[PDB]
Amino acid sequence: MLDAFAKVVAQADARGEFLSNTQIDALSKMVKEGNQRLDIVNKVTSNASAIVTNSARALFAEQPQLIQPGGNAYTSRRMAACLRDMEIVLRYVSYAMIAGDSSVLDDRCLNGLRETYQALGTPGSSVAVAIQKMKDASVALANDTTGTPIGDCSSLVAELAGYFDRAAVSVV
Amino acid sequence: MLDAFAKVVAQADARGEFLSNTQIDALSKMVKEGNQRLDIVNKVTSNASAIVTNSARALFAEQPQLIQPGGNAYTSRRMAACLRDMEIVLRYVSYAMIAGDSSVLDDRCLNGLRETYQALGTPGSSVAVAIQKMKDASVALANDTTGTPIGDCSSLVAELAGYFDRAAVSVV
Amino acid sequence: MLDAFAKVVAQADARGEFLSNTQIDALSKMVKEGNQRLDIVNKVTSNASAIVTNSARALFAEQPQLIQPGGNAYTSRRMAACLRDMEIVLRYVSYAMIAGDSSVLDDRCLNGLRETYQALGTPGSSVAVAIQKMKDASVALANDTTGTPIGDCSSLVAELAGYFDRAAVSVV
Amino acid sequence: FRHFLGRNLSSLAEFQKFFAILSKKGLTGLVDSLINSREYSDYFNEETV
Amino acid sequence: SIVTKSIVNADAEARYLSPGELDRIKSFVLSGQRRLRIAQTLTENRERIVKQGGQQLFQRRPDVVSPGGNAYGEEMTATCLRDLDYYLRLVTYGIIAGDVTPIEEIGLVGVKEMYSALGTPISGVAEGIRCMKDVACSLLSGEDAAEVGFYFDYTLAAMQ
Amino acid sequence: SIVTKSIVNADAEARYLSPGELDRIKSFVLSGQRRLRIAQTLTENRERIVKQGGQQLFQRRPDVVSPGGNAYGEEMTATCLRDLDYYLRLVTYGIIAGDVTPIEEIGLVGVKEMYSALGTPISGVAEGIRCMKDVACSLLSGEDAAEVGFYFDYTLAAMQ
Amino acid sequence: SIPILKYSLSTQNQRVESFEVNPGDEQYRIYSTDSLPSSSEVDQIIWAAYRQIFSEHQILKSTKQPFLESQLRFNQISIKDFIKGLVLSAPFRDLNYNVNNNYRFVEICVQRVLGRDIYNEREKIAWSIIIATQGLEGFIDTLLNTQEYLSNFGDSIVPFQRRRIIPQRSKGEMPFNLKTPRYGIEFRSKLAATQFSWASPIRRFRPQEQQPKAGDPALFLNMVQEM
Amino acid sequence: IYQNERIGLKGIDNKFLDNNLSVKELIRSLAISDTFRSLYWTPLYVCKSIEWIHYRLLGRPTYGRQEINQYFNIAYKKGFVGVINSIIDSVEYNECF
Amino acid sequence: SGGVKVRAAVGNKSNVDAPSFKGSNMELADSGADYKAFPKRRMPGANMQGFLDMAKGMKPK
Amino acid sequence: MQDAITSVINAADVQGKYLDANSVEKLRGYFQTGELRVRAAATIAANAATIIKEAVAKSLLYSDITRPGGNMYTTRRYAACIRDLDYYLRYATYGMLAGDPSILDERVLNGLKETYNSLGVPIGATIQAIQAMKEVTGSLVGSDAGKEMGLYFDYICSGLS
Amino acid sequence: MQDAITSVINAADVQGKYLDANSVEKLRGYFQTGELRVRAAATIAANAATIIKEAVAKSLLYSDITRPGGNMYTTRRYAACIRDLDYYLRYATYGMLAGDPSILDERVLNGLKETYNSLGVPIGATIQAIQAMKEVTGSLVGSDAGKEMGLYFDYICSGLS
Ligand SMILES: C=CC1=C(C)[C@@H](Cc2[nH]c(/C=C3N=C(/C=C4\NC(=O)[C@H](C)[C@H]4CC)C(C)=C\3CCC(=O)O)c(CCC(=O)O)c2C)NC1=O
Ligand SMILES: C=CC1=C(C)[C@@H](Cc2[nH]c(/C=C3N=C(/C=C4\NC(=O)[C@H](C)[C@H]4CC)C(C)=C\3CCC(=O)O)c(CCC(=O)O)c2C)NC1=O
Ligand SMILES: C=CC1=C(C)[C@@H](Cc2[nH]c(/C=C3N=C(/C=C4\NC(=O)[C@H](C)[C@H]4CC)C(C)=C\3CCC(=O)O)c(CCC(=O)O)c2C)NC1=O
Ligand SMILES: CCC1=C(C)/C(=C/C2=NC(=C\c3[nH]c(/C=C4\NC(=O)[C@H](C)[C@H]4CC)c(C)c3CCC(=O)O)/C(CCC(=O)O)=C2C)NC1=O
Ligand SMILES: CCC1=C(C)/C(=C/C2=NC(=C\c3[nH]c(/C=C4\NC(=O)[C@H](C)[C@H]4CC)c(C)c3CCC(=O)O)/C(CCC(=O)O)=C2C)NC1=O
Ligand SMILES: CCC1=C(C)/C(=C/C2=NC(=C\c3[nH]c(/C=C4\NC(=O)[C@H](C)[C@H]4CC)c(C)c3CCC(=O)O)/C(CCC(=O)O)=C2C)NC1=O
Ligand SMILES: CCC1=C(C)/C(=C/C2=NC(=C\c3[nH]c(/C=C4\NC(=O)[C@H](C)[C@H]4CC)c(C)c3CCC(=O)O)/C(CCC(=O)O)=C2C)NC1=O
Ligand SMILES: CCC1=C(C)/C(=C/C2=NC(=C\c3[nH]c(/C=C4\NC(=O)[C@H](C)[C@H]4CC)c(C)c3CCC(=O)O)/C(CCC(=O)O)=C2C)NC1=O
Ligand SMILES: CCC1=C(C)/C(=C/C2=NC(=C\c3[nH]c(/C=C4\NC(=O)[C@H](C)[C@H]4CC)c(C)c3CCC(=O)O)/C(CCC(=O)O)=C2C)NC1=O
Ligand SMILES: CCC1=C(C)/C(=C/C2=NC(=C\c3[nH]c(/C=C4\NC(=O)[C@H](C)[C@H]4CC)c(C)c3CCC(=O)O)/C(CCC(=O)O)=C2C)NC1=O
């Protein structure tokens, strides 16, 4: 597991030189944005169980055959497993937002998630539909200017949007 | 594990359809042959160790190269394993005769069994004739009328035959 | 787990007969010089520590890039893991010299070692010459006639040289 | 000729007679001038492909 | 197109084009402004016309997508929608060419040999194009829906 | 390959192949088992051999990736690594053909005209192949690294 | 009386040592009952036992074991008797034992219980006759009395996947819940008539002429974004 | 020719450039190269190459069968270089050029 | 079953060695059979009975 | 002008992919027969004049193409034959080594049947000469090597037909 | 158009001699395999559509000749393939019964490679389709019968090359 600072340390550890004085200015620009980072995470971790169930409900109206009798997410054993499966993806996306780099997203979550949907028979294209349902709810809640000073945060919600459509192309 | 009743239900819940009235009567057909279904199994477990040792001796009246030095079933660990596997196969087909379909037979025993023996080096078709030495030691033992009165029950012993040759082609 | 005394007993009852006496004196060919065997292995076991430390330092004079930054053995965990592998391979050739055959060498050490070196990015060429650096330095350490009684035993120093390169053809 | 007669052209004048017909009436004028010849009828009249 | 087969018609007959042929090449090119608008509607609605096209196709033919159906699994269902994207593309060609000549020699000539040789139910793919037709004609007015639907049902006719 | 130009050599000279030519076609085909193993190593190491290949290339030539360099931005840098994947592929052909004949008529003949006409510094792409060579020879033993590196430096020679 | 089939080992990460004194970040969190937890910290052990022996799915209300949970909190049974109650639990039979055979169930009970991968495929052959002779309750206590269970878990540690990652690296191996799911490809494909008949919904429509061909620079844009 | 294959001919150019070589020897030095043999003798029919090669060296195509017989029979015995030498060392080359 | 002890066990290994000329008694593979379709040719016939009869003349010389 | 390795590299390159298991699978199949082809090309180089002398005497030596009026009457015309048959036995040797008949149609087959019709050379007698030449070539190099060298003779006979 | 018996009679007749022991020796060899060829031609007639469906799906089904721009894109062009592959599996069946590949070049091979170059049909993908079709044909008829039917497939692939 790395954070954003660890990928600059461990890169030049393989090159073996000291960290340059123009690279410290890139790390100090990150800690100036370090407190706008912490309320993108606090906005999405607090409405976490309503990002999930409002995105599942939007999925099951577009593709109604996933919940009809003989469908994949039909029973009450497997509706709960489908609802869990978006909670785990939203968990590791917010983990990779607070670290700054995606090295824990594709390690404990995406490392072979595609190959276990071929074994389970789960439609992997429909999990990537319901991740982009959750991307549209989470970047709208990271623009919420209540209890926070007004400023430009467009470069950090575009990084949160990057970890959502990385986990969508890794299941199809 | 599904019995004969659950295989009707699992096909009807997958389509989301109730059970019809003429479907109930075919399962009510099964329970008036209920004593005849049960006392077949009261033969084949009560003479069960006789069926093993009669067939295992008579296999080497047919293929004595297994007990040859260098052969597969030569040694006393391996002779104890050949009577082991014929005791297990006789055990699961008694479970399917009390069920009514072979779903406990090909989920426990026969699933992935050819690839065991080819990785073991055991001759595949040469254990299938040991199963067919147990069927005629049991379907003749089922037609014996000790203690029970007389009625036409050739339909049930065909299914008792029908498990022994479903199991015979799964090891070849 | 068999040895050279059990090597011919495996071929004995695979055929299936008693022990022919063309080999019973030829199994008394090395219980004469089994007294010559145990003081040959007393130089690779009781002087194991100079072998891995000298040859690794001479290896890096042959390849200067494997102690550079970007090299494979660069940090302190890797360089400790490198001698951990080199003291586990000449562990098992002292386990191979005590048994006559090489059945504990390939199984408990080398069974998959070519795969995991490709699965770690280690070059298989330079881990072969890590053992060739300790191949000639093990037999020339075995050829100290001082401290021991004297006489030519060039049979066993071809056997023990014949096990170091068996690892060196199993890792590339 | 390969299709409606089962043979190649024979001469040069057999070309110019049948090229001028196709030159003036196209496909419907050419194929009707082969099917209505005598050489068709001698080999195939009304029943033999 | 109407231009190329009105030519090859009069080409075979050893003659030029009649007023009946030249007052329609004339009538077609003045129609060309309205044709590109119609094809422009279907061009960037392929996301909704194909995906909703396969919507009704599976609801009406669950066999083809059920286990054992030809388009079963994540793989075949993607190709299951790929063909609909093909046939939706050819209808855009037929609308601009003013004829099913583009649809004729692409996706229609010998189509039964392909789908019979692929194991695909040819009646099933015909059901798919009909589902796309209701989505397509729902995107246009009545004057246009008599055209865009008009090319689909020709594809329905030749596909059975 | 060595087989095709040992033929066309003796072809032009109006003669058959000498023992010097036929004891090497013989010597090459017995070498064929070892060649496929070497090419098999580079085949599924292209992820590291290319990505680490462009690793040292940018550290040694930051101009080409800096703003104004030919491979600047997300776009050109992807194509910046695409060419290295090409030349790494041709080296796998040369190893199996036992000659740079595949590398000759692909990626070498007239290469200066292409890269001069693309605005790319041809010396820069030569630096890229050298960085791939150190990664490639680091993946093989000494007996193999005298071959896999041997085809790279020929590509280095012709690329300047 | 029929000892086990003498299989062979292989090369793995758990049978060497790490040289990791003061291990930094990827430690897999030894929950234990010798650290004397509070009643809110017994609850963080019982969730780790449910996540290890089941997956993260089957921690439902019906799959909880509320009488086995209370005997852990009274210190009546150990962790080793609590893992044995979870494999013999009736949710573990009908969800993870009725839907695969005996040669895949051994791959579950060595990946989750012992925390290591299987050595080779003969070990699945060598272990699967224990389940068919004396049963699943005879299979777990001969798997919990091995030396690999006692020498790094013992009587007080909920098990875990030992040495999943290499300490200088960041990728490592696959987690075992994402390695072996509830059922495999061989149980799913044979039942496509009664169960598992779903047919797949429609993918997002990609047009065919926008797909990259050999010699296109759009096949290297994922390489350039990793620079 | 491209710069990749012209490097093999650079020994021939500046040997001509310091006035150490005639034009005829320059022409024969180019035509007998492997750069030429790999382009017009190798990838062509054995009689079309003689026809094409005859058209570059001498400024005309062949007259009839006897002329094309004669050069072609040379390719039986000596081969590619033997045909080029038999044209540049011909009587018609030395008369016109 | 004849001798129940498996007939053989090929009385042991004395001087049992590989230099055993495999198929030393005796031959194999006949070549005159193969089957070429053409003869090996010859001249004379038709057009040439004149000169054969006439090379008898000098044959004996 | 491609050998078996050139053709394998071309098809694997023309799709822009590496040499996968199927491409190397055929390459290993070619390297296995590499020892057979050289010895086949060895003896054919030695007995080049003897093979052509055997073919013409066995196929078309005494037929009436050899007599006056036949297509092979004059000494220039007879000498052109053994010159002509030498190419078929020579280029077939090249195809046997390269393991690919691309060199034949590149340098022999194209414009060949169109040339014999110009000269009036009988294609029927030509193929039977090559067939007889194929028959003697199986004598020298053996059965399987004759199967290899014979596989390119009828390739010439097929296209020349 | 000659079978094994026709070719044996022709060579024995072309020298004006009777059917000696060598000519009948091959004829007896053909009659021994007469039972194998009919059963080979039996199952191939039954699974004609299944074999061609297996070959195209295994060799060139998803390659980019199948996609737009590839040589097999339009439905007329796709339908021409299975029509075209039917002849190769059919005429190879005739060669397997007749025991002589004379019918192939008589009715298939001549003007074939010269025709595909005109249309622009890829000869490379064609041979791999026939190779894959040869692979499935060895599945049905067995090993030796597949060796017989396979012996005429590569004859088509050789001449078509
Ligand atoms: C542990 C809890 C914890 C938090 C929740 C944050 C909360 C937080 N954010 C800011 C400070 C800020 N917070 C924002 C954030 C936003 N403005 C917007 O318009 C967006 C809606 C939103 C984030 C997406 C900005 C833009 C600033 C800096 C003000 C500026 O530079 O303009 C500050 C003041 C810091 C300072 O004065 O230096 C604090 C305490 N930090 C924490 O430690
Ligand atoms: C513990 C297990 C167990 C059983 C096996 C049955 C035993 C049993 N079987 C029958 C009754 C019967 N049992 C049989 C069965 C047979 N008769 C034959 O001749 C065949 C040998 C054999 C079938 C293969 C038949 C046919 C009847 C009905 C008698 C009749 O037909 O009149 C009855 C009388 C009441 C009834 O019908 O149930 C009982 C108690 N009950 C049990 O609790
Ligand atoms: C209980 C543990 C135990 C040991 C460690 C050895 C130690 C040992 N070795 C030898 C004795 C010997 N040891 C060697 C062996 C060698 N000498 C050389 O010069 C070579 C370098 C080296 C080969 C490996 C030889 C050659 C003899 C002399 C006996 C002989 O072979 O004639 C003797 C004297 C008695 C004897 O001959 O056996 C003893 C005690 N023996 C044991 O019983
Ligand atoms: C380590 C982190 C982690 C990952 C990445 C993970 C994936 C994962 N998803 C699973 C199941 C599942 N996933 C789904 C999800 C869906 N099916 C649908 O129809 C929808 C399209 C979609 C979501 C809405 C369903 C229904 C199952 C249950 C399988 C079953 O019981 O048949 C399973 C099997 C049981 C489970 O643990 O939930 C795994 C192992 N599990 C993990 O523990
Ligand atoms: C799911 C139910 C189930 C089945 C069916 C099963 C089969 C099974 N049979 C086995 C071995 C065996 N099976 C046989 C049996 C035979 N060999 C012969 O030559 C005869 C044909 C035949 C006896 C009549 C023998 C000899 C072995 C021992 C192989 C060995 O130990 O090397 C083994 C290897 C472990 C062992 O017993 O040593 C398994 C896993 N295991 C199961 O759990
Ligand atoms: C432009 C005219 C045109 C068409 C139509 C066309 C079709 C076409 N459909 C194919 C496959 C396929 N097509 C389907 C289609 C279906 N499955 C169903 O259940 C449905 C009924 C149906 C779609 C609505 C499936 C499942 C495959 C894959 C079959 C296999 O993998 O064996 C393939 C082979 C793979 C490929 O190259 O794409 C072609 C060429 N090509 C063309 O050039
Ligand atoms: C198999 C032999 C072979 C090669 C080598 C090849 C190269 C090649 N390189 C190209 C572009 C390019 N190549 C580069 C390359 C570089 N920029 C740098 O700074 C570096 C010095 C260098 C790479 C290491 C760039 C930036 C472009 C895009 C130029 C542009 O967009 O104007 C293009 C045009 C786009 C394309 O079709 O890919 C071709 C054809 N083609 C071939 O067939
Ligand atoms: C069954 C007995 C057994 C075997 C056979 C075994 C092999 C083994 N060698 C390993 C690593 C290794 N092996 C080497 C060795 C070398 N790399 C070099 O560059 C040098 C050329 C060479 C030694 C001089 C290194 C450096 C690592 C660690 C890789 C790393 O952590 O970066 C690892 C990875 C885990 C670890 O860090 O220890 C295993 C599992 N382990 C075992 O327990
Ligand atoms: C390398 C590929 C290749 C071939 C094959 C080739 C053939 C070729 N054969 C020729 C003539 C000839 N070829 C023959 C051959 C024959 N007469 C017979 O009856 C037989 C059937 C046959 C011998 C097998 C004869 C007699 C001539 C002379 C024709 C004449 O003087 O009119 C000529 C005219 C010029 C010359 O021989 O100098 C050419 C160019 N050229 C090529 O580049
Ligand atoms: C009995 C001997 C014999 C053969 C073999 C034969 C072939 C033949 N193949 C043809 C076309 C064709 N052949 C193909 C075949 C292919 N496309 C591919 O990508 C594949 C590599 C290949 C399938 C294996 C296609 C696509 C056409 C149509 C070409 C066009 O419309 O331009 C045509 C043009 C006319 C027509 O099909 O109606 C002929 C005459 N004729 C014969 O008499």
PDB file of all heavy atoms in Angstrom, chain C residues 35-36 38-40 42 142 145 149 151 153, ligand 3:
ATOM      1  N   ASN C  35      31.729 -44.830   6.015  1.00  0.00           N
ATOM      2  CA  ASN C  35      32.689 -44.194   6.909  1.00  0.00           C
ATOM      3  C   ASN C  35      33.494 -43.111   6.196  1.00  0.00           C
ATOM      4  O   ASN C  35      33.931 -42.149   6.838  1.00  0.00           O
ATOM      5  CB  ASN C  35      33.607 -45.274   7.500  1.00  0.00           C
ATOM      6  CG  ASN C  35      34.584 -44.732   8.528  1.00  0.00           C
ATOM      7  OD1 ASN C  35      34.236 -44.524   9.690  1.00  0.00           O
ATOM      8  ND2 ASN C  35      35.820 -44.518   8.104  1.00  0.00           N
ATOM      9  N   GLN C  36      33.685 -43.235   4.884  1.00  0.00           N
ATOM     10  CA  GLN C  36      34.224 -42.165   4.057  1.00  0.00           C
ATOM     11  C   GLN C  36      33.184 -41.119   3.685  1.00  0.00           C
ATOM     12  O   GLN C  36      33.558 -40.041   3.214  1.00  0.00           O
ATOM     13  CB  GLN C  36      34.845 -42.732   2.773  1.00  0.00           C
ATOM     14  CG  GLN C  36      36.280 -43.192   2.923  1.00  0.00           C
ATOM     15  CD  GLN C  36      36.451 -44.427   3.783  1.00  0.00           C
ATOM     16  OE1 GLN C  36      36.864 -44.329   4.938  1.00  0.00           O
ATOM     17  NE2 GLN C  36      36.202 -45.596   3.207  1.00  0.00           N
ATOM     18  N   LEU C  38      30.721 -39.656   5.757  1.00  0.00           N
ATOM     19  CA  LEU C  38      30.271 -38.710   6.773  1.00  0.00           C
ATOM     20  C   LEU C  38      31.323 -37.654   7.078  1.00  0.00           C
ATOM     21  O   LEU C  38      30.979 -36.569   7.556  1.00  0.00           O
ATOM     22  CB  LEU C  38      29.880 -39.446   8.055  1.00  0.00           C
ATOM     23  CG  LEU C  38      29.039 -40.718   7.936  1.00  0.00           C
ATOM     24  CD1 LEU C  38      28.752 -41.295   9.304  1.00  0.00           C
ATOM     25  CD2 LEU C  38      27.743 -40.482   7.180  1.00  0.00           C
ATOM     26  N   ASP C  39      32.599 -37.938   6.816  1.00  0.00           N
ATOM     27  CA  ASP C  39      33.609 -36.894   6.942  1.00  0.00           C
ATOM     28  C   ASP C  39      33.808 -36.113   5.652  1.00  0.00           C
ATOM     29  O   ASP C  39      34.628 -35.193   5.629  1.00  0.00           O
ATOM     30  CB  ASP C  39      34.942 -37.475   7.411  1.00  0.00           C
ATOM     31  CG  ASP C  39      35.595 -38.360   6.382  1.00  0.00           C
ATOM     32  OD1 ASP C  39      34.875 -39.136   5.716  1.00  0.00           O
ATOM     33  OD2 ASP C  39      36.832 -38.284   6.249  1.00  0.00           O
ATOM     34  N   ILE C  40      33.088 -36.460   4.588  1.00  0.00           N
ATOM     35  CA  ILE C  40      33.030 -35.582   3.427  1.00  0.00           C
ATOM     36  C   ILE C  40      31.991 -34.493   3.661  1.00  0.00           C
ATOM     37  O   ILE C  40      32.241 -33.310   3.396  1.00  0.00           O
ATOM     38  CB  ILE C  40      32.762 -36.422   2.155  1.00  0.00           C
ATOM     39  CG1 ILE C  40      34.063 -37.100   1.694  1.00  0.00           C
ATOM     40  CG2 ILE C  40      32.150 -35.599   1.013  1.00  0.00           C
ATOM     41  CD1 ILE C  40      33.893 -38.047   0.526  1.00  0.00           C
ATOM     42  N   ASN C  42      31.116 -33.359   6.555  1.00  0.00           N
ATOM     43  CA  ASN C  42      31.537 -32.526   7.681  1.00  0.00           C
ATOM     44  C   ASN C  42      32.318 -31.275   7.262  1.00  0.00           C
ATOM     45  O   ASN C  42      32.735 -30.539   8.163  1.00  0.00           O
ATOM     46  CB  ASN C  42      32.379 -33.345   8.661  1.00  0.00           C
ATOM     47  CG  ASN C  42      31.608 -33.745   9.906  1.00  0.00           C
ATOM     48  OD1 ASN C  42      30.814 -32.967  10.434  1.00  0.00           O
ATOM     49  ND2 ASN C  42      31.848 -34.958  10.386  1.00  0.00           N
ATOM     50  N   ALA C 142      35.977 -29.886   0.374  1.00  0.00           N
ATOM     51  CA  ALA C 142      35.815 -31.286   0.741  1.00  0.00           C
ATOM     52  C   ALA C 142      37.103 -32.085   0.593  1.00  0.00           C
ATOM     53  O   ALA C 142      37.199 -33.184   1.148  1.00  0.00           O
ATOM     54  CB  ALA C 142      34.717 -31.929  -0.109  1.00  0.00           C
ATOM     55  N   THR C 145      42.715 -33.320   3.094  1.00  0.00           N
ATOM     56  CA  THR C 145      43.090 -34.595   3.684  1.00  0.00           C
ATOM     57  C   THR C 145      43.609 -34.442   5.107  1.00  0.00           C
ATOM     58  O   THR C 145      43.708 -35.448   5.817  1.00  0.00           O
ATOM     59  CB  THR C 145      44.123 -35.302   2.799  1.00  0.00           C
ATOM     60  OG1 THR C 145      44.372 -36.612   3.315  1.00  0.00           O
ATOM     61  CG2 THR C 145      45.424 -34.518   2.737  1.00  0.00           C
ATOM     62  N   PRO C 149      41.979 -39.378   7.769  1.00  0.00           N
ATOM     63  CA  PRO C 149      42.862 -40.325   7.079  1.00  0.00           C
ATOM     64  C   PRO C 149      42.757 -40.215   5.561  1.00  0.00           C
ATOM     65  O   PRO C 149      41.775 -39.717   5.005  1.00  0.00           O
ATOM     66  CB  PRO C 149      42.378 -41.687   7.587  1.00  0.00           C
ATOM     67  CG  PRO C 149      41.801 -41.382   8.925  1.00  0.00           C
ATOM     68  CD  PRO C 149      41.090 -40.080   8.711  1.00  0.00           C
ATOM     69  N   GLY C 151      43.328 -41.054   1.357  1.00  0.00           N
ATOM     70  CA  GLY C 151      43.005 -41.981   0.286  1.00  0.00           C
ATOM     71  C   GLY C 151      42.027 -41.384  -0.713  1.00  0.00           C
ATOM     72  O   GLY C 151      41.209 -40.532  -0.353  1.00  0.00           O
ATOM     73  N   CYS C 153      39.014 -40.629  -2.983  1.00  0.00           N
ATOM     74  CA  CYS C 153      37.569 -40.821  -2.937  1.00  0.00           C
ATOM     75  C   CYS C 153      36.883 -39.938  -3.964  1.00  0.00           C
ATOM     76  O   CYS C 153      35.953 -39.191  -3.659  1.00  0.00           O
ATOM     77  CB  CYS C 153      37.009 -40.545  -1.549  1.00  0.00           C
ATOM     78  SG  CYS C 153      37.493 -41.745  -0.297  1.00  0.00           S
TER      79      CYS C 153
HETATM   80  C1  LIG L   3      30.515 -41.196  13.197  1.00  0.00           C
HETATM   81  C2  LIG L   3      30.886 -40.415  12.200  1.00  0.00           C
HETATM   82  C3  LIG L   3      32.044 -40.727  11.323  1.00  0.00           C
HETATM   83  C4  LIG L   3      32.873 -39.799  10.545  1.00  0.00           C
HETATM   84  C5  LIG L   3      32.829 -38.304  10.406  1.00  0.00           C
HETATM   85  C6  LIG L   3      33.935 -40.465   9.771  1.00  0.00           C
HETATM   86  C7  LIG L   3      35.331 -39.972  10.148  1.00  0.00           C
HETATM   87  C8  LIG L   3      36.399 -40.947   9.713  1.00  0.00           C
HETATM   88  N1  LIG L   3      36.978 -41.079   8.490  1.00  0.00           N
HETATM   89  C9  LIG L   3      37.891 -42.068   8.560  1.00  0.00           C
HETATM   90  C10 LIG L   3      38.720 -42.541   7.425  1.00  0.00           C
HETATM   91  C11 LIG L   3      38.821 -42.043   6.041  1.00  0.00           C
HETATM   92  N2  LIG L   3      38.078 -40.990   5.625  1.00  0.00           N
HETATM   93  C12 LIG L   3      38.436 -40.800   4.332  1.00  0.00           C
HETATM   94  C13 LIG L   3      37.797 -39.738   3.516  1.00  0.00           C
HETATM   95  C14 LIG L   3      38.512 -38.710   3.038  1.00  0.00           C
HETATM   96  N3  LIG L   3      39.819 -38.573   3.208  1.00  0.00           N
HETATM   97  C15 LIG L   3      40.324 -37.849   2.222  1.00  0.00           C
HETATM   98  O1  LIG L   3      41.508 -37.732   1.963  1.00  0.00           O
HETATM   99  C16 LIG L   3      39.235 -37.187   1.438  1.00  0.00           C
HETATM  100  C17 LIG L   3      39.448 -35.681   1.410  1.00  0.00           C
HETATM  101  C18 LIG L   3      37.973 -37.603   2.186  1.00  0.00           C
HETATM  102  C19 LIG L   3      36.856 -38.077   1.259  1.00  0.00           C
HETATM  103  C20 LIG L   3      35.479 -37.576   1.660  1.00  0.00           C
HETATM  104  C21 LIG L   3      39.421 -41.795   3.840  1.00  0.00           C
HETATM  105  C22 LIG L   3      40.020 -41.920   2.482  1.00  0.00           C
HETATM  106  C23 LIG L   3      39.697 -42.651   5.001  1.00  0.00           C
HETATM  107  C24 LIG L   3      40.669 -43.816   5.074  1.00  0.00           C
HETATM  108  C25 LIG L   3      40.050 -45.202   4.915  1.00  0.00           C
HETATM  109  C26 LIG L   3      40.125 -45.662   3.477  1.00  0.00           C
HETATM  110  O2  LIG L   3      39.313 -45.214   2.644  1.00  0.00           O
HETATM  111  O3  LIG L   3      41.011 -46.484   3.168  1.00  0.00           O
HETATM  112  C27 LIG L   3      37.970 -42.705   9.886  1.00  0.00           C
HETATM  113  C28 LIG L   3      38.852 -43.840  10.329  1.00  0.00           C
HETATM  114  C29 LIG L   3      38.052 -45.139  10.350  1.00  0.00           C
HETATM  115  C30 LIG L   3      37.452 -45.441   8.996  1.00  0.00           C
HETATM  116  O4  LIG L   3      38.208 -45.673   8.030  1.00  0.00           O
HETATM  117  O5  LIG L   3      36.211 -45.467   8.896  1.00  0.00           O
HETATM  118  C31 LIG L   3      36.975 -41.945  10.656  1.00  0.00           C
HETATM  119  C32 LIG L   3      36.612 -42.141  12.097  1.00  0.00           C
HETATM  120  N4  LIG L   3      33.742 -41.898  10.104  1.00  0.00           N
HETATM  121  C33 LIG L   3      32.688 -42.010  10.955  1.00  0.00           C
HETATM  122  O6  LIG L   3      32.300 -43.145  11.407  1.00  0.00           O
END
